[PDB]
Design a protein around this ligand. Structure first.
Ligand SMILES: O=C(O)c1cccc(CP(=O)(O)O)n1
Ligand SMILES: O=C(O)c1cccc(CP(=O)(O)O)n1
Ligand SMILES: O=C(O)c1cccc(CP(=O)(O)O)n1
Ligand SMILES: O=C(O)c1cccc(CP(=O)(O)O)n1
Ligand SMILES: [Zn+2]
Ligand SMILES: [Zn+2]
Ligand SMILES: [Zn+2]
Ligand SMILES: [Zn+2]
Lengths: 266, 266, 266, 266
């Protein structure tokens, strides 16, 4: 006779969990996550901002890299998120407990975060993580300012209802650099058409392709660096092959159209 | 070079996950969980009560057994908990989504439940589950009435701050049967003395031994049946060897005293 | 010398608080709120649904009217909301405590409800009420089915980010009646242009006018009956003068355009 | 005919709302609330702690006094609470939005705070305020350290289930001063005996009298200064007439015994 199956842990490619030292993107912006998961530190004269944290087991590594950059736990003021799945918001609860950081997110991301990713529209309870509360709810196009760096929220619903692109302007060589951190545009294993949990899913993805295409975007970064052709292990040429926001959106839409056609056939 | 470790799933003995058909305890009280995890269904002319649900993957099994008893999802009115760890409160979030059930718990259990068991005083984030919200907060000694069956809360903090014994009176052969569902009194791997997260841990356990000893208790049940010498696979003699509440409390205190002495030596 | 001002209660026109007996709209749909606040009861062979509850002090009145309709507290299964302001979601927390009802709402409404209407984008903390938790989060276009009556959510953001129209089909004289419960389209005292808390406010209102215009709509109802030209005190001719959804949307847009012009001038 | 009553605002004595300039208690401890509501600022080389905030409309005043003390919004690290009623936790939600502050509280206080004081065991929904979330849950006897000042939690349930005394050691004239901020021991209009919402209320009050009696207590402060015979308007002799913790506990118990006798007679 047969017991119910054991719970299955959320396991990922080893490179997603491979720690790296801080990689500078612009004058105040650093990649401090792992080889294949983005976690951006923005350092200001008035505290630091973290955008995404990667997987749940990455908290101490993130804190180590912040320390290397001169950022103590007290100095981290704000956490922002691309979307509230386990491999990007994983360590948020722990980071809040261990730092001064407060979380700002839109309503959709906040409720999913507060559920620890449970009851996912597509994944069910398959990919959960420690829940956390948002300290501030943001609306589309709203700005948040830290130490004089201005972050703008651009909603791009689809991958999750609360998927967000964050944009800000840094400097490099005395010139402004408009950085766009665009969320995933993938739909891995999703039912796209006639999904009872997400009836306007296709319309939202189409709108989000257009949103991403139009972002202020000298430099594109994505939660999975491979999606924008970043190679965090490539040192001085880490960002050399990076896509434009236009190319990223076009590639995503072509892939999406292919998935729709396969779904109709399958 | 070395990636961070993969997340590890909460795995348990196979018997904890072995489904069983409903086993009657008294006229309206049934064990409907697995061979080694208690989940009690109390059926009234005015809806049903569930006490504990076991592991997260047990939700559909529980619903199957309720169906066998004549209880539809709409008929489940109340979920009560011994304590809010993954192997007793595991399926609560899913049960709430799939039934009419509302959760009643004390403040300590409610906040741990709302965290999905994360930031545990002793386990950290090692044993998490889908978070759920409590619909009603109960105080020590408070009663809840369903279809005329009266449940009384008896706080017995220690195993968790919110650990609770639930008592009610059923019938068997035209005679009243005072059922006591007493929580765990174990402290598995806990730092008992001078624990910064639980400074009065020892005092609370001592008080809880006394509480359990004094419960109205014709029949004792526990979240792990083995703790009270139940054998759910033993049919007509499933409860024959069951401990009294007095014996259960005495055994727990003797084990506890032994652990304290070992901790001092270790 | 001068103390800080006393807290000021949210007071409303007397007619908003004037109880009325149940007024039938269609075969299973009744107005059971007050003369000037809508609260719709939909009764099915499988439980009842409430859409809106009005002000916080209306809970017992609502329960009285449900009782008159043959609906006991146990029978109320679902609460739906137009938007989560105090004069429509006021008694929700109390209704949940006193009935079997669970709340379904979109993410925006759920977070505002969970705040008890505090930190409002426009009202600040001026209009608060007892907070409540949502049991189910719904997406745009999603359906919920109770006793065979199908409710469809139509997001119409503007008055609040989470403003929703609910539609369902009832019967009257053996013929189907498509009922549309459309949310408010007012913007009372709002800063419309360049609002830092709601940067796309105007775009959202414009989209919502179009949404409301296109609803399936044999009969329009609104949270304030006056907005759709209902007169709940007028008995057999209560709904005689009711607007179409098209007329309601056109009137709202004309008023909105006038407010925009005044704001530019003011 | 008769409308339902208007909502009634929580109004208080004018002196409760009378702003005062900061009054020094010890080397790093200041009263910064109003004449008749305590709000203590503790300033450390590593950030500031606030204990209580008074009424909801006191937020800006508190921020003004912090500014006068050299504490900017970014500098406020921690909010602690005596108990989560509107006249002590009132401005907590707003303070969190406007400062770097995180809230630490026990489970009972956290759930009441998260409800904005609604569904009070004794007051119902009569005295509500903006809800806030706790960032850290503390256990009885647990310590929290800020800038080297150590705060110890002493649970003293009764006035609310989550009522807490906070103790710490400051200095004055090169000598240590053990400060005890003890919560209210009043029971205003409470049903004491056989209260279904608080069955062990009397036992908890008795235990709390003993707890307060035994606190480390060179200087006693209370949320209402009058309870400990403080006079915040009396300048250099503000604390001259202050009770010991022993005298405060004895007075509270005598008053309590009198109320019990009156309740039995009434
Ligand atoms: O191309 C992408 O954006 C991409 C790649 C791997 C995986 C996912 C899904 P998640 O972002 O939830 O890991 N997306
Ligand atoms: O003796 C017990 O009560 C016992 C047995 C196995 C395991 C545990 C811990 P949990 O109840 O969290 O599974 N307790
Ligand atoms: O025309 C309306 O929809 C209308 C009328 C009165 C008041 C309001 C605002 P609320 O719906 O928050 O009461 N709206
Ligand atoms: O003596 C007291 O502690 C006292 C005085 C006035 C009022 C209250 C009740 P609250 O602390 O809720 O204002 N308590
Ligand atoms: Zn994802
Ligand atoms: Zn346990
Ligand atoms: Zn409104
Ligand atoms: Zn109080």
């Amino acid at each position: 006779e047969v017991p119910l199956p054991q719970l299955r842990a959320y396991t990922v490619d080893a490179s997603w969990l491979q720690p790296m030292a801080p990689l500078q993107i612009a004058d105040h912006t650093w990649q401090i996550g792992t080889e294949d998961l983005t976690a951006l530190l923005v350092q200001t004269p008035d505290g630091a901002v973290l955008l995404d944290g990667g997987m749940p087991q990455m908290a101490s590594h993130l804190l180590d890299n912040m320390k290397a950059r001169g950022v103590t736990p007290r100095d981290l003021r704000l956490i922002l998120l691309s979307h509230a799945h386990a491999d990007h918001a994983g360590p948020v609860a722990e980071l809040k407990r261990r730092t001064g950081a407060k979380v700002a997110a839109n309503a959709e991301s906040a409720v999913l975060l507060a559920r620890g990713g449970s009851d996912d529209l597509h994944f069910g309870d398959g990919i959960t993580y420690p829940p956390a509360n948002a300290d501030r709810i943001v609306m589309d196009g709203e700005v948040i300012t830290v130490g004089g760096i201005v972050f703008t929220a651009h909603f791009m619903a689809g991958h999750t209802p609360g998927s967000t692109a964050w944009t800000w302007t840094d400097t490099r060589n005395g010139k402004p650099v408009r950085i766009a951190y665009a969320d995933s545009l993938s739909a891995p294993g999703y039912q796209l058409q006639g999904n009872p949990r997400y009836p306007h899913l296709i319309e939202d993805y189409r709108r989000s392709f257009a949103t991403v295409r139009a972002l202020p975007c000298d430099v594109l970064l994505t939660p999975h660096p491979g999606a924008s052709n970043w190679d965090y292990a490539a040192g001085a040429r880490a960002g050399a092959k990076a896509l434009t926001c236009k190319a990223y959106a076009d590639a995503a839409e072509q892939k999406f159209d292919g998935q729709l056609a396969k779904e109709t056939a399958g």
